[PDB]
């Protein structure tokens with residue numbers, strides 16, 4: 001009975017708001033993604049080996065020879081992307097509806113994002129293809145830009161003077177475990193949310209009109225789970241190599257760099273902000289601040305209205321910030337030549353300008369229009 | 373007159389006990405029915421190209 | 432008394448189940 | 454002068470289509486909560502229903518018929534006089550605490 | 553006009569019953585009813601005879617929310633049998 | 642009074658089988674239930690088909706692979 | 714490069730068919746349940 005009572009107050013008769021749109025469905029999907037990555041991942045690790053001699057052979061052994069090994073792999077590989085799509089929806093929802101006003105919930109969120117980024121980055125190294133190796137070699141070396149200890153920090157991280165067998169084997173250890181730290185953090189993410197209750201699209205206290213989670217949001221989250229599954233299985237069964245890079249089917253080779261070098265799609269916006277700045281340290285700090293600025297969002301909030309539902313100027317600038325991110329994601333994918341350098345430069349400044357300068361000013365104007 | 377769907381409710385799935393027996397047996401049959409159908413659809417879609425179509429050839 | 436037909440029906444439901452996946 | 458564009462923004466905001474006044478949409482905090490607590494029975498029980506109806510609309514993804522929309526001229530600032538006093542008393546407590 | 557028309561319609565002999573109970577003789581009650589109540593009309597004008605159309609039961613809820621009152625009153629029910637049904641027992 | 646309160650008209654939202662307010666619903670009730678509970682059961686069957694396959698595939702990966710079966 | 718290619722597309726067909734079956738059935742259950750709230754009618758009745 002002490003457990004059922006936790007599950008009651010969690011999932012059965014938790015008072016949810018009555019008017020919650022499908023933008024709140026992504027939280028439950030992120031858990032479904034996390035559990036999917038864990039279950040698929042476990043079954044991959046049952047056959048995968050983390051030695052540079054065998055790493056590639058083992059992944060191909062899974063696809064070819066392990067019974068239904070391919071379907072487990074591409075569910076992991078594309079589920080990783082679906083996790084990230086869901087994340088960027090889940091983060092944006094909070095930006096739009098002002099859900100960042102649950103400070104701790106939000107700040108635990110910001111951690112959850114960063115841990116998944118690290119998880120997925122280290123995961124991508126594991127199969128030991130060209131883009132996996134060279135992705136690590138590029139992205140890790142960035143830390144050497146740090147003032148006085150980066151060059152040491154990188155060699156310590158790697159376990160040597162380059163990305164190598166020392167790095168791959170620990171990257172597997174870190175991948176297999178950090179997901180569980182993520183799940184632990186996620187339960188605290190939920191723990192602060194019950195303290196604070198849940199937000200609704202109006203940004204108006206819905207204590208006057210609550211409804212029990214079950215049966216309403218149970219069946220709604222079930223419906224949404226099938227749409228996530230559909231979206232996964234469309235990718236898995238019809239387009240498993242769509243989001244993935246071809247060069248990672250070429251086995252890794254440190255003596256031969258592929259020409260168009262890049263991270264996966266979910267880091268390209270941040271990669272584009274890094275490339276925007278020419279100075280190395282500046283590029284790293286902008287890359288960092290691109291993610292970490294999320295923590296300043298609740299301090300940058302100005303409007304007397306919580307939600308953007310009743311805020312035109314903010315809505316337009318929000319939808320500008322989305323388009324600007326999709327611009328940066330595009331630019332990060334393309335090589336560093338004209339005209340993409342200047343587009344990337346403007347897009348990167350626009351990104352920080354929307355967040356830091358404009359959207360606060362918009363909220364302040366929006367107040368003055370309504371006599372606030 | 374007892375209707376079409378009410379006749380199912382009344383005797384087949386009013387109790388939750390029989391509800392499950394219906395689902396289980398229905399799922400048992402559905403699996404045979406659907407797989408067989410969707411296999412045949414896929415095999416007609418891809419006529420002559422699979423091994424089973426060109427197996428008699430080399431055997 | 433009354434749970435004999437229910438437990439028999441659930442006994443059948445469970446039985447076919449083990450046939451269901453295996 | 455710009456009462457025009459103020460009235461445009463009011464209509465463009467859209468809370469009036471849900472039958473909400475401006476002060477129904479104010480973000481709650483320690484001051485607003487306190488101002489809302491100070492409200493007399495009638496204004497409290499009214500905002501309760503106005504919000505309860507607006508959420509019910511927001512669930513169904515609909516708005517009220519055009520005549521039932523809140524009017525920029527008839528948009529009463531019911532919460533302000535209380536909230537001003539709560540803020541002024543907090544400012545006083547802070548100014549006294551300063552010394 | 554409404555009250556008198558409602559009376560003229562509904563208050564009539566075949567739709568009425570005279571009950572009694574105590575120390576009294578059935579013959580005497582019948583004499584009193586014959587002497588006083590037989591003045592009532594005995595059928596209709598060939599119409600105006602209202603007969604009960606059956607009422608639709610609807611599974612549904614009504615929630616008069618009122619926190620000011622001290623104690624919540626709840627009444628829940630399913631569709632009933634009707635006067636005639638032996639099941640009532 | 643509280644007798645002023647009549648319940649608003651649900652004739653818009655009602656099913657066809659309960660629209661006549663002079664008609665006992667009990668004859669339609671079993672059909673109305675049987676329709677909705679059929680949807681549920683059909684869904685459960687459809688998921689049960691899927692769930693069986695998903696599980697069976699993961700179980701099969703854990704079983705003996707092709708290359709081990711080949712060189713046995 | 715892709716020996717799974719045939720089998721994978723058959724799973725694809727079966728997935729599309731099965732998703733085609735389930736999505737409306739689940740959506741119907743969601744609508745059936747939420748109906749209670751979606752049809753509801755709020756009446757305010759203060760005293761004088």
Ligand code: HEM
Pocket residue numbers: 034037038039040041042044045048059073076077080083116119120123124125126127175176177179244
């Ligand atoms: C948030 C959770 C997870 C994410 C986002 C994630 C992401 C990834 C990604 C992107 C890859 C590379 C896929 C490719 O292109 O081949 C990968 C590979 C792998 N992951 Fe994960 N993963 C997660 C959890 C797990 C867990 C929990 C395990 C084990 C318990 C696991 C085991 C593996 C293994 C063995 C590989 C190598 C095989 C392969 O490349 O497919 N993963 N992961």
Ligand code: HEM
Pocket residue numbers: 023024025026027028030031034087090091094097099100102105106107108109110111112113116182186189190193198199200294
């Ligand atoms: C593993 C990743 C994540 C999981 C499993 C997770 C889980 C959840 C869940 C279950 C909810 C409640 C459902 C909902 O309202 O959507 C929720 C809400 C929320 N999460 Fe997350 N979350 C994740 C990532 C994040 C991130 C990255 C952020 C912010 C950077 C964040 C901030 C929030 C906020 C602010 C809410 C409140 C939603 C509301 O307004 O009602 N979460 N999260």
Ligand SMILES: CC1=C(c2ccc(Oc3ccccc3)cc2)C(=O)C2CCCCC2=N1
Pocket residue numbers: 010011014016017020024025027028031032035190198217221
């Ligand atoms: C607590 C909570 C959950 C929720 C439900 C189940 C969760 O756990 C799961 C994790 C993985 C899979 C399934 C459930 C997590 C959050 C929601 O969806 C919502 C959706 C909108 C109402 C507020 C809300 N509150």
